[PDB]
Design a binder for this molecule. Structure first.
Ligand SMILES: Cc1cc2nc3c(=O)[nH]c(=O)nc-3n(C[C@H](O)[C@H](O)[C@H](O)COP(=O)(O)O)c2cc1C
Ligand code: SF4
Ligand code: SF4
Ligand code: SF4
Ligand code: SF4
Ligand code: SF4
Ligand code: FES
Ligand code: FES
Lengths: 156, 226, 227, 120, 439
């Protein structure tokens, strides 16, 4: 049971006249559904395929190729801590240990109440202020393991 | 004389490759002293093939360079996959070496035909009569294929296809069982709505049980809800 | 054209790629991702030959023979040690995650991957880590699916999408987690979905009708017939 | 697992069998017959077995009155124990799912990672 | 440090309050004047010749000259459908210059890409930005609105008649999207798989049309070259490479950040002058010049200028010229493990050697981390690196992936041999079968 809304369909069409190929709006349509629901369910792939005209296999391959498009359901807030080389020099291991101590989950798993989802990510473009952690609209920098409980309590 | 080309389709039973016939089975055919041992421990006759150039046995020829066109299977030493056809071809992706099997019966004629002046009239949908539109299925039209038990799950259920306007005229919706009588026999089928069909026609699956392919292009009488 | 394979002169077609020209002459080159009907993409990295710029060259250059055209006066080598080492290494990398499934696999004795593993001479394993596994989709009553045996050679997607014009078979995921199949469980809707059992070099797509009453290829009594 | 390697490895061709499959997907022989009037006791079938199912035992007293009774079917060949190899199990190594072993539960196999997983 | 426009033509109009520069302040500081000069009195082929004379090279890391890339398009005038792309992906780790550029200077990039479109007759433009740059995307969209309301984009640009429009496409988090052919494939809406050469993206790029992709730094250095002359741009750095470069250090240093330096600057001159050295009690063990895809170098290679050819025979690459220093406390085994883990989880997985050999190297490094190394692991790493060179794989992502591996092998082999503790045991004993004792 899936149905694209009028606003989502209008946004997808608005992205569609930007390019000369309706296939080129597949990533942006998936991101639109991602913003408007939090994850891409099973019927959303078929809905995007029906709206765009490309087959559902292409939309499924695009959704599963990119890491920032989620096909499994997540919590209200996602945690994307950087684990690349500069943040490894800056010591993201203490941040990961503090996150696993607080949330009592594993990287890739979600909490029982859906409060947070612990994920690693790629480079965040904030090497000079590493380590960095990406929440939905915030790029937290200069992370310390003592400040992790203070930072996690401001998101509900 | 119009079928005189079938002699060249394949060579006769005296055809040999350096004296030996063509093997039906590979070189490592197994179990020959035990495949029939439950019936009798004495091995039976190897079946003699007087009709063709093949033998029902290991003892034959299946070399990729054999001067022949009828290749029973592709096998080469080190190429056990279907990629042994590369060994059995003159060039890969081209023809079979020493020519492809089969021969065309007739050549292209020098002079052609004339224009068929009989241009048909338009289709006029008459009331009470329904034109049968053939809807062929890859699984269900050829009779021997419907006999196959693995095709009975792949084939669709027999659905009679109707226009939305015709379905509105009879007042039947999708999935409803309607009955029709042809040659004095009433048969019922569930209705599927076809938007691409035209009015005055009715779609039927040719080849299925009870719906002969001869029904295509024929009128249909007494289309009513069951 | 004119090619020099290990010093031997060969006459081939100039428009052909080097792999198909060498296969036409009876020379054995391992290959997975190339099919005569599907074209070439150069994924499997299996058809390496060492090409030389001129007649007297020592180092040469390792090149892919399914991308290299068979131009006139093309000097290549197949059986030299560097190319054989690279092809054995590629087979070994394909063999890292491959399941221990040959006795219980319908492609045993009919497998392109088995033939190319044996042809490269790779028989000693030095991989001691874990092997990736995949869940098996249901593809209907004709095609049986087993994604553990895949080598990510992209022949199925090429045939089914580009050649056969299908719409419900694709590749998903990235790196070594690529999955070839439908987005969900269901029957492969193409009328030519059965050719995947010959396009696939491995046992991912197998004949389920044959799998019910299965026997190996050497045990089969074959005849040439017309459908 | 009815893989037919012993039957093809037999130089006399005195092994006949047919693959059957259970509901969980494991392979087994529907029947297994050996023509012991033809068998030369060379041990090539035991050498070719990838599961160590077929074995040759220290038993020579197989004399018979009728030659038809030298065809040993599956009920005469399958014994109650592991024979000369007490611990080997092929299905602990095979990467095909059966009852008691899901995908990733075989030896040296990681857990299956779905393409819809959240991990990068 | 005051950056005069005479030697710093890129970072002389910056603001120190961390606030973006809008259209008014950019127009006050020599905005859209050279672009007017080019669109009025200078032919597009003459702009191409000026780029040839200036010797502008690619800032993405390849070092390819911009003029040669611009001149590779065919001479057929019937192919009017032309695309210009700005590679604002910045997916390489250790690089953070484009975020700082876009947070305070979008209009310079817009103007430079406008000239690059006019010089190449490109009618459509796209900025491919990564998906984790939210404020950069907001600032770019506001710059689009301000330029469109001022007539800078669209139809009839100051009476020239050239039609051009720019759209911003956000990324979706994949490192392989940064490659040019993969960027073209991901722009079309398919999986970001690279394309083999032949063909070339200058002939058949986006949707088969002529399409050229340039870096943000190249498109921002273009206005300085065009407006302040060509011979003046040649008279900035006296070396084989002409121009300036965004440079800086990151990772356990006193003053990490971004500055602008000309070609020929030695790597030591950023350590104690701009970065001010490291923290307390840290020894210079290693450094890596061009982000995660470049070779590591030692202290003997620190006294070596940052050019392209200078690092060419040094056994490394210039890269993005944003180096990162590894001290003595950070073990190189864990660092190389993390680098290969990133390069394996963010690989595209098209071709066999990288796809099925980077996990093998990752597992070998995981074993070497825990002391579970076995004899036959380092040699496996060398064999994989030798069989992962330029052209041994489908593209150049994997040579850049195993450049750090071979560099840490060459310079720090003693740290990798310490992980080998147990003998090679691949098999387990099977009761009833005597093993073949290989010698
Ligand atoms: C694997 C790979 C990743 C790349 N990632 C980026 C990137 O994230 N951002 C970028 O500006 N260039 C990146 N590049 C470089 C360009 O995509 C391209 O290779 C070329 O060097 C661009 O030339 P330019 O500097 O003139 O724009 C990458 C190159 C490769 C091979
Ligand atoms: S696909 Fe080939 S190599 Fe893989 S298990 Fe089957 S027969 Fe063996
Ligand atoms: S499923 Fe088969 S054809 Fe498809 S990529 Fe894998 S090995 Fe190749
Ligand atoms: S021991 Fe007997 S059954 Fe086994 S291979 Fe030899 S002859 Fe055949
Ligand atoms: S006895 Fe062994 S070799 Fe013979 S079919 Fe069974 S598993 Fe295969
Ligand atoms: S080297 Fe790796 S990233 Fe590049 S094409 Fe091959 S699989 Fe993809
Ligand atoms: S390495 Fe973490 S922000 Fe760049
Ligand atoms: S056959 Fe050439 S790389 Fe696959």
């Amino acid at each position: 049971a899936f149905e694209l809304s009028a606003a989502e369909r209008e946004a997808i069409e608005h992205e569609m006249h930007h390019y000369e190929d309706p296939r080129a709006a597949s990533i942006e349509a998936l991101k639109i559904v991602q913003k408007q629901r939090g994850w891409v369910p099973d019927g959303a792939i078929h809905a995007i395929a029906d709206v765009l005209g490309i087959p559902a296999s292409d939309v499924e391959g695009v959704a599963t190729f990119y890491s920032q498009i989620f096909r499994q359901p997540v919590g209200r807030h996602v945690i994307r801590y950087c684990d690349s080389v500069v943040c490894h020099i800056n010591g993201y291991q203490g941040i990961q240990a503090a996150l696993e101590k607080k949330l009592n989950i594993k990287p890739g798993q979600t909490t029982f109440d859906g409060r947070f989802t612990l994920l690693p990510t790629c480079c965040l473009g904030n090497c000079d202020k590493g380590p960095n952690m990406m929440i939905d609209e915030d790029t937290h920098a200069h992370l310390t393991p003592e400040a992790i409980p203070e930072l996690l309590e401001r998101y509900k | 004389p119009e079928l005189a080309g079938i002699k060249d389709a394949a060579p006769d039973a005296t055809f040999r490759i350096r004296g030996q016939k063509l093997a039906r089975e590979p070189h490592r055919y197994s179990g020959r002293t035990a495949m029939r041992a439950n019936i009798s421990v004495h091995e039976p006759r190897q079946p003699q093939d007087i009709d063709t150039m093949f033998t029902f046995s290991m003892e034959g020829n299946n070399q990729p360079t054999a001067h022949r066109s009828q290749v029973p299977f592709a096998w080469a030493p080190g190429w056990n996959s279907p990629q042994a056809w590369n060994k059995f071809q003159d060039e890969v992706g081209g023809k079979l070496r020493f020519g492809d099997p089969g021969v065309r019966l007739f050549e292209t004629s020098e002079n052609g035909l004339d224009y068929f002046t009989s241009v048909p009239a338009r289709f006029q949908p008459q009331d009470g009569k329904w034109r049968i539109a053939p809807y062929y299925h890859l699984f269900g039209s050829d009779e021997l294929s419907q006999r196959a038990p693995v095709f009975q799950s792949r084939m669709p259920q027999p659905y009679i296809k109707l226009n939305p306007a015709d379905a509105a005229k009879l007042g039947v919706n999708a999935g409803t069982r309607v009955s029709f009588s042809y040659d004095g026999n009433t048969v019922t089928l569930p209705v599927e709505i076809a938007e691409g069909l035209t009015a005055g026609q009715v779609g039927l699956p040719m080849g299925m049980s009870g719906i002969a392919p001869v029904l295509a292009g024929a009128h249909l009488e007494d289309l009513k809800e069951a | 054209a004119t090619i020099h394979v290990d010093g031997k002169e060969y006459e081939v077609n100039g428009a052909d790629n080097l792999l198909e020209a060498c296969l036409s002459l009876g020379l054995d080159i391992p290959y997975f991702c190339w099919h005569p009907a599907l074209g070439s993409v150069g994924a499997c990295r299996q058809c390496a030959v060492k090409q030389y710029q001129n007649a007297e060259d020592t180092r040469g250059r390792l090149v892919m023979s399914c991308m290299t055209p068979a131009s006139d006066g093309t000097f290549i080598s197949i059986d030299d040690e560097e190319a054989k080492q690279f092809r054995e290494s590629v087979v070994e990398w394909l063999m890292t995650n491959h399941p221990h499934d040959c006795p219980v696999c319908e492609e045993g004795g009919n497998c392109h991957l088995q033939d190319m593993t044996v042809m490269t001479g790779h028989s000693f394993r030095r991989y001691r880590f874990t092997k990736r596994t995949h869940r098996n989709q249901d593809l209907g009553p004709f095609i049986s699916h087993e994604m553990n045996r895949c080598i990510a050679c992209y022949r199925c997607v090429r045939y089914y999408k580009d050649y056969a014009g299908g719409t419900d078979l694709g590749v998903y995921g990235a790196h070594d987690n690529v999955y070839f199949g439908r987005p969900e469980d269901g029957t492969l809707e193409s009328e030519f979905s059965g050719n995947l059992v010959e396009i696939c070099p491995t046992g991912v797509f197998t004949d389920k009708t044959h799998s019910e009453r299965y026997n190996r290829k050497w045990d089969m009594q074959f005849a040439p017939s017309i459908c | 697992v009815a893989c037919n390697l012993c039957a093809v490895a037999c130089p006399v061709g005195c092994i006949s069998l047919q693959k059957a499959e259970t509901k969980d997907g494991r392979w087994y022989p529907e029947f297994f017959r050996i023509n012991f009037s033809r068998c030369i006791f060379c041990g090539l079938c035991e050498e070719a077995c990838p599961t160590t199912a077929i074995q040759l035992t220290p038993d020579f007293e197989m004399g018979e009155y009728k030659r038809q009774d030298l065809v040993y079917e599956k009920e005469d060949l399958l014994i109650s124990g592991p024979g000369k190899y007490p611990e080997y199990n092929f299905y602990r190594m095979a990467g095909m799912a059966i009852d008691g072993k899901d995908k990733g539960e075989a030896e040296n196999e990681a857990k299956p990672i779905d393409v819809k997983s959240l991990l990068p | 440090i005051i950056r005069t426009p005479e030697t710093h033509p890129l970072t002389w109009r910056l603001r120190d309050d961390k606030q973006p520069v809008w259209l008014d302040e950019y127009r006050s500081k020599n905005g859209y004047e050279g672009a007017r000069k080019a669109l009025t009195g200078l032919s597009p082929d003459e702009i191409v010749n000026q780029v040839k004379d200036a010797g502008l090279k690619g800032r993405g890391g390849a070092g390819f000259s911009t003029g040669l890339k611009w001149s590779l398009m065919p001479k057929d005038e019937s192919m009017n459908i032309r695309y210009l792309l700005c590679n604002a992906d910045e997916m390489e780790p250790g690089t953070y210059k484009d975020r700082l550029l876009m947070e305070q200077l979008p209009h310079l990039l817009v103007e430079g890409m406008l000239i690059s479109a006019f010089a190449l007759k490109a009618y459509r433009g796209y900025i491919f930005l990564r998906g984790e740059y939210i404020e950069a995307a907001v600032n770019l969209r506001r710059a689009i609105a301000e330029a469109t309301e001022a007539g800078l984009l669209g139809k009839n640009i100051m009476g020239t008649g050239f039609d051009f429009e720019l759209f911003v496409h956000t990324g979706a988090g994949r490192y392989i999207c940064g490659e040019e052919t993969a960027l073209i494939n991901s722009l079309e809406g398919r999986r970001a798989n690279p394309r083999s050469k032949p063909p070339f993206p200058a002939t058949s790029g986006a949707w088969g049309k002529p399409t050229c992709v340039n870096n943000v730094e190249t498109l921002c250095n273009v206005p300085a070259i065009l407006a302040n002359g060509v011979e003046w741009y040649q008279n900035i750095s006296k070396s084989k490479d002409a121009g300036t470069k965004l440079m800086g250090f990151s990772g356990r240093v006193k003053n990490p950040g971004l500055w602008e330096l000309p070609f020929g600057t030695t790597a030591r001159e950023i350590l104690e002058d701009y970065a001010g050295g490291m923290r307390d009690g840290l020894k210079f063990k290693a450094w890596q010049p061009g982000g995660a895809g470049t070779d590591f170098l030692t202290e003997a290679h620190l006294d070596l200028p940052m050019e392209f050819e200078s690092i060419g025979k040094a056994g490394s690459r210039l890269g993005t010229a944003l180096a990162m220093a590894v001290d003595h406390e950070i073990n190189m085994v864990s660092l190389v493990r993390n680098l290969e883990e990133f390069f394996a989880r963010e690989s595209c997985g098209w071709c066999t050697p990288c796809r099925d050999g980077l996990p093998w190297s990752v597992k070998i490094l995981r074993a070497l981390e825990r002391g579970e190394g076995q004899p036959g692991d380092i040699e496996t790493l060398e064999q994989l690196c030798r069989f992962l060179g330029p052209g041994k794989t489908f593209c150049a992502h994997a040579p850049g992936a195993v450049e750090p591996l071979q560099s840490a092998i060459k310079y720090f082999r003693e740290e990798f041999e310490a992980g080998i503790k147990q003998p090679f045991s691949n098999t387990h004993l099977i009761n009833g079968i005597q093993p073949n004792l290989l010698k």
